Design a binder for this molecule. Sequence first.
Ligand code: HEC
Ligand code: HEM
Ligand code: HEM
Ligand code: HEM
Ligand code: SMA
Ligand code: SMA
Ligand code: FES
Lengths: 73, 99, 365, 181, 49, 62, 22, 66, 49, 241
Amino acid sequence: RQFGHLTRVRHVITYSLSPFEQRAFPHYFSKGIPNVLRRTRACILRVAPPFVAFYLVYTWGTQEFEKSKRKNP
Amino acid sequence: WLEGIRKWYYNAAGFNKLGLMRDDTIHENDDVKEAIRRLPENLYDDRVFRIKRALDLSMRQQILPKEQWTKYEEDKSYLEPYLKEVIRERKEREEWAKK
Amino acid sequence: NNAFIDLPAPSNISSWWNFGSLLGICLILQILTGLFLAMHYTSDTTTAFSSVTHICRDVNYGWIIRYMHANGASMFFICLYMHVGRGLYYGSYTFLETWNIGVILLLTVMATAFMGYVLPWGQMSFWGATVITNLLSAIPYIGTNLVEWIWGGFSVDKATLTRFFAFHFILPFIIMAIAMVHLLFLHETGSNNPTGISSDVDKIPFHPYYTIKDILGALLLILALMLLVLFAPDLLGDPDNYTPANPLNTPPHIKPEWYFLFAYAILRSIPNKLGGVLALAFSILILALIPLLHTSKQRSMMFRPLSQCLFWALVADLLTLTWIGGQPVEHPYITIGQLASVLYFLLILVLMPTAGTIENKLLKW
Amino acid sequence: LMKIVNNAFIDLPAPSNISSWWNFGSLLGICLILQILTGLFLAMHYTSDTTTAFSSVTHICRDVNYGWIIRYMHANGASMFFICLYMHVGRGLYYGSYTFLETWNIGVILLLTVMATAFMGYVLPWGQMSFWGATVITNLLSAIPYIGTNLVEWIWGGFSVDKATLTRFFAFHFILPFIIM
Amino acid sequence: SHTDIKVPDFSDYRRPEVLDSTKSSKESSEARKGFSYLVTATTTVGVAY
Amino acid sequence: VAPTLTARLYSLLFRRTSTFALTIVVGALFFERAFDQGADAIYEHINEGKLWKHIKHKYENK
Amino acid sequence: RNWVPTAQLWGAVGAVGLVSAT
Amino acid sequence: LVDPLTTVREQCEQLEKCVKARERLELCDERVSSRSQTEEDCTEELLDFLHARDHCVAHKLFNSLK
Amino acid sequence: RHRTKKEIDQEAAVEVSQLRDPQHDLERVKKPEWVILIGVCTHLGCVPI
Amino acid sequence: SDLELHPPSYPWSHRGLLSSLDHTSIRRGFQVYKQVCSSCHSMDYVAYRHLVGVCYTEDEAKALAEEVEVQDGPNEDGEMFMRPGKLSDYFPKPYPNPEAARAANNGALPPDLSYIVRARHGGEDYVFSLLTGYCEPPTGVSLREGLYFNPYFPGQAIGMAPPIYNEVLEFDDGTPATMSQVAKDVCTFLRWAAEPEHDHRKRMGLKMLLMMGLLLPLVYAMKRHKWSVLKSRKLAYRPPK
Ligand code: HEC
Ligand code: HEM
Ligand code: HEM
Ligand code: HEM
Ligand SMILES: C/C=C(C)/C=C/C=C/[C@H](OC)[C@@H](C)[C@@H](OC)[C@@H](C)CCc1oc2c(O)c(OC)cc(OC)c2c(=O)c1C
Ligand SMILES: C/C=C(C)/C=C/C=C/[C@H](OC)[C@@H](C)[C@@H](OC)[C@@H](C)CCc1oc2c(O)c(OC)cc(OC)c2c(=O)c1C
Ligand code: FES
C-alpha cells in the first residue's frame, strides 16, 4: 500500500500550519480537561459496572471465606 | 415501543456525533466494496467527506457540536439499493455454480 | 523505507495501537538480557540454581540484567493481553492471517516463558515443569509416552533441564521470525483504526507521526519496567522459587505465574482430567474462532454499546479468574471459579454474537 | 505463500550450462542445516560448566541413544562444511563470480563467521585442543595496540581461559549459526 | 471561483510572536526554531546519558 | 537590539548539523557529572548515617 | 567545500563521544 | 535489662480491642479447660488477640530500638 | 506410611462401589498397618501432602 | 491448625522507596548470625569477601575469616587438610548434608538463610515476628516433643526452639542485646544477605525517576510539536454544484 494508490478523493481542501508557527499545547488545560471529563463520562456506564460487580463478588467471596474458617461465623 | 429504544440506541451508538450516517459505518467486505464502486459521483464524494471528517474528529478525540449530529429521523440508507443488488447478483452466481 | 518511513498509517490510531511496537521492544529486551544471562548460566541440575545466584551476586550488574529479564517477561504479557484486547474490541481480527499468526505468537510466548521459568530450578520451576508437561498425558493411548519422551526420563530431571535451556534459547528467535511474518501480512492491509471504518481517505506517513509516538510509548514501557526492577523486583514473582527444587515436596500454596492464573483457574474448575485440559486448550484456541463468531455489520465496538458492555464483562471476568487462580481450592472460590469459567465461554460463544445481531436489528440492517 | 518460493525457486531462471562446481552452494545450505539439526540435539545434552563439559560429551557418545552418530555427524559435518566452502570459493575465483560484488563480499563475511563459529564449537568439549585453541585464537586480539590485552580478558571474562569463557562460548556458538543462516 | 477560497483564521494556534500580520515573521524565526531544537538537543543528551 | 536566548542558541549551536551534534556530546558530558554528583548527594543525604561511607571512619586507620 | 568544516565538527563529535562515553 | 518489647506489649494490651480479645481468649480457656474431652482449642482466640496486639506493637516498638 | 488402627478402620469402611477407581483397601496393601505408594498425583504429577 | 496469623508491618529504616539499609545494623546482624544462627543454619551464598565495604573493612573481614578452619586440598600427597579461612571462603556449613542436619535437629531441617527473606511472604516482617513471637500453646493445643508453639509459623508448630533472648550475645558496639534488638538487627542482615544489590537499585531508581521526569515531558513536547500540523489542520469540502 503506497501513497498515490490508496483511494479516490475529490473536492477536499486541507489547510495546515508549520509546527514552527504554532503552539504545541494550545488550551491544554482550558480545553483538555473538559474533553477528558466528557470522554470519561461518555464511557463510564459501559466500562465501570462489570468492575463494580467484580468488586462485589471479590469482597463477598473473601468475607465468606474468612467467616467459614472460624468457630462462630 | 421498540422504536423508542431504537432512537435511544442510535444516540448511544454515537456515530451520529461524528457526523456519520449508518451506512458510512458498515464493515467493508467484497459485496460492500462493489456497492461503493457503483455509487454515483455525489453519493461517493459525500461519503468520502463524512468519513474523512469523522476520522479527523477521532484523531482529536473530539465530536461535533450537537446541532451537527446526524439526526436519527434523517438518516437514510443510500447504500442499500446498491448493496442489495450486488448480493443478489452473487447469490445468482452461487446458485448457478451448484447446478 | 516502504515498510517503515513512508508506510501509510491511519491518522487516528490511538495508544491502543502502541502495543505492537511495545511487544517488539519486549522481545528485543528479552533477547538481549537473555543472551547476557546465558553467558553465565549453566543447565546442570547440580549447578543451575547456583549459577543464577552467582549472576545476581557476583557478575557485574548481573542482578539488574536478571530482574530486567524476569520483569520483562511480565511486561511482555501485560502488553500481549492489551494487544489482544485491542484486537477483539476493534475487530482487528478480521485481518485473518495476521490474527491467526498472532494466536500462534501467543502460544509460543507462553511456551517460551514456561520453559524459562524452569531454568533457575527453584521449587516453582520444578513443579511447573511437572504439571505443564503432564498436560500432554491427557492425550489418549500415547499421552504418557509423549511426556516421558519430552522429559527424557520417567520424571523431570537433568535431561529435562538441559533440553529446556536449549528450547528456551532458540524459541524467541523463532518468535521473532514469526512476528516478521505477522507484520508482513498486516502490511498487505495496513492498520485498522478505532472507528473500524476504512482510513484510506486519511492516511498519514508512519514517520514522523508514529515513530515519535512509539518512542513516547517505549519510554513509558521502560518506566514501568524499571519501576518494577529498581523498586519492587520481586513484586510479580513467587517467593517459593527462591527455594531450590525439591522433588519430594510440592509447596502447599503453589500457584502459577500471574499471567497464567486465569487459564489455571479454568482448568482447576473442572473435576475431570481430560475435561480440564480440553478447557485449558480451548480457553486460548477459542481466539481462532472469534472471526467466525462476528455477527455485527460493523467492524469495531466503538459504535456498539451492548457489545462494549459484554466486552468489559469479559475483561472483568478474566480479572475474576485471575483472582480465583490465586486462591485455595476451597468454598466459595470453587463455585465462583466455575461460574467465571462458564461465563468466559458463554460471553465469547453466545452472548457477544447475540449482542451483535440485536444491535444490527436496532439499526435496521 | 506461493510466490517467493515460487519466483525464487521453481521458475527461477538458471544458466543451461552450470556444472557440478555450482552444486556447492546448495551443499553449503545442507551443511548448515545439518550442523544446526545435529547441533540442537547435542545442545539438549551438553552442559557448559568446566567441571562437566567433557563428561557431558562422553555421556552423549556413550549413553544417549544414537548420541554417538549425532556427535560424529556434527564433528565431521564441520569438516564437510569447510571442504565445500573451499570448493565454493575456488569456483568463484576461477570463473570470475566475484564480479557479483555484493554477493561476493557477503560471502567473505560468511567464510569468517563460519570459521569463528567452528572455532568456538571446538572449544566446547574442553579437551586439550579445545583449551589451547581458545587460548591462542582469542589472543590474536592481543596484537591490537593499546587495548588488545584488555579486549582478550574481556572476551575471557578473566585473566585466563576458564569457566566464564566456556560458558559464553556455548552461547556464542549456539546463536552464530542462525546469524549465518 | 477559486478566488473565493481564503485560509481559515489560525490566531488561536499561533505562537504569540507571529500573531501580527503586519510584521515580518523572520524576526522571530531563529527564536522559534531555537526553542523546539533546544527541546530536541536536551532530549538527545538525556538519552545519551 | 539584543536577540532572545533560544535565538542565540539556534544560531550558535543548532543551525549547523556539525555544531548541533557537538553540543549534544559536550552537553551530555557536563550533564553527566552534574547529574550524578547531584543525585548521589540526594541519595546519601536521605540516608545520612546509614551508608558504609558514613560509618567507615570508625573502623579504619591504615 | 563545507565538508571540511562539517567533517571537522563530525570529527570533534566522535572524539568527544569516545573520550566521554568510553 | 528490660526489652522494650515487654513495655510496648504491656501498653498495647490496654487497647479496647486487645482487652476484648483477651476476654474471649480467657472465656475459651475456661470453657475448654473444664471438659475432660473436647476437640476445641483456643488457637483462633489467641491469634485474634495477637493480631490486635502486634499491629499496635509494630507502630511503636522500633522507636525504642537502635 | 505407618497407619494407625483408626485409619485402617476408616479405609475398610469405605463404600467401594462409590469410588471412581474402585478398590478395597485390602487389594492395595499386604500388611494393613503399612501402605506403600508412588507419591505422584495421578492428575498432573505433583506430590500429595 | 489451618488458621493463619499474618505479620504486621514494621517500619524498617530500609522500607522507604529511596531508603537504604542501615549498615551498622547489618554489621550487628552479622554478629547475630555468626554467634547464634550459624550453628544450625547455613548461608551457602555469602562469602567473607561480600562483607567488605558493606559492614566490615577488608582487614576485619580477613580476621573474621581466619577465626574458622576450612578444608582445602588435595596437597601433594593427595590429602585434604585444614587451614585458616580467607576472604574467598563461603560461610562454613554447620552440617555436611541435610540428613546430618535433620538428625541433629529432631528431624527438622534448618533451611539455608541466604534467601530466607525473599523466600518467605512477609520477608523480614515475617522473620522478625517469628523470632519474637514464641508463646505458650493455647488451651487445648498439645504439641509432640520437639515442637514449639509459634503463632506466626504455618500450622503454629515449629521444630526450632526460641533461638534468641536478652543477652544471647554481646554486640561489638555495646548496643543493648535485648531480644527485640537482636531480631531487628539479624533481620536487617538477612535482607542484605538476600538482596546485596538493595542500596544500589534504589540509588539507580532515584536517577531513573529524575531522568524520566526530564525525558517524558520533553519527548511528549516533541510529539505535540510534530502532531500540531495535524491537530490544528482544517478541512473544507467544495463539491461541484
Ligand atoms: C538450631 C538449634 C537452631 C538455631 C540456633 C536457629 N534455628 Fe532457625 N531453625 C532451626 C530448625 C530446626 C528449623 C526448622 C523449623 C521447622 O519446623 O521447619 C529452623 C527454621 C528457621 C526459619 C524458617 C521458618 C520457616 O518459615 O520455614 C527461619 C527464618 C529461622 N529458623 C531463622 C533463624 C535465625 C535467624 C536464627 C538465629 C537467630 C535461627 N533460626 C537459629 C533450628 C535453629
Ligand atoms: C511476539 C508477539 C507479537 C508481536 C511482536 C506483535 C506485533 C504487532 C505489531 C508490530 C503490530 C502493529 C501495531 C499495532 O497495531 O499494534 C501488530 C498488529 C496486530 N496484531 Fe500483533 N503482535 C504480537 C502478537 C499478537 C497477538 C497475540 C495477536 C492476537 C491474538 C495479534 C494480533 C494483531 C492484529 C489483529 C493486528 C492488527 C491491529 C490493527 O490494525 O488494529 N498480535 N502486531
Ligand atoms: C520471548 C522471550 C523470552 C521470554 C518471554 C523469557 C522468559 C523467561 C522467564 C519467565 C524466565 C524466568 C526468570 C526468573 O524468574 O528467573 C527466564 C529465564 C532465563 N532466560 Fe529467558 N526469556 C526470553 C528469551 C530468552 C533468550 C533469547 C535467552 C537466552 C538466549 C533467555 C535466557 C534465559 C536464561 C539463561 C534464564 C535463566 C536465568 C534466570 O532465571 O534469569 N531468555 N526467561
Ligand atoms: C555453522 C554451524 C556449526 C558449525 C560449523 C559447528 C562446529 C562445531 C565444531 C567444530 C565442534 C566440535 C566437535 C567435536 O566435538 O569435535 C562443535 C561442537 C558443538 N556444537 Fe556446533 N557447530 C555448528 C552449529 C551448531 C549449533 C546451531 C548448535 C547448537 C544449537 C551447536 C552445538 C554444538 C555443541 C553442543 C557442541 C558440543 C558437543 C560436541 O563437541 O559435539 N553447533 N560444533
Ligand atoms: C517442551 C514444551 C512444552 C511441554 C510446552 C508446553 C506449553 C504449554 C502451554 O503453553 C502453550 C502452557 C504454558 C499454557 O497452557 C496454554 C499455560 C497457560 C498453562 C498454565 C498453567 O501453569 C501452571 C504453572 O506455571 C505452575 O507453575 C508452578 C503450576 C501449575 O499447576 C500446579 C500450572 C497449571 O496448572 C497451568 C494450567
Ligand atoms: C569470541 C570469538 C572470537 C575471539 C573469535 C575469533 C575468531 C578468529 C578467526 O576466525 C575468524 C580464527 C578462528 C581464524 O583466523 C582467520 C583461524 C584461521 C585461525 C587459525 C589458527 O587456529 C589455531 C588452532 O585452531 C589451534 O587449535 C589447537 C592452535 C593454534 O595455534 C597454536 C592455531 C593458530 O595459530 C591459528 C592461526
Ligand atoms: S490435583 Fe493436579 S497434580 Fe494433583
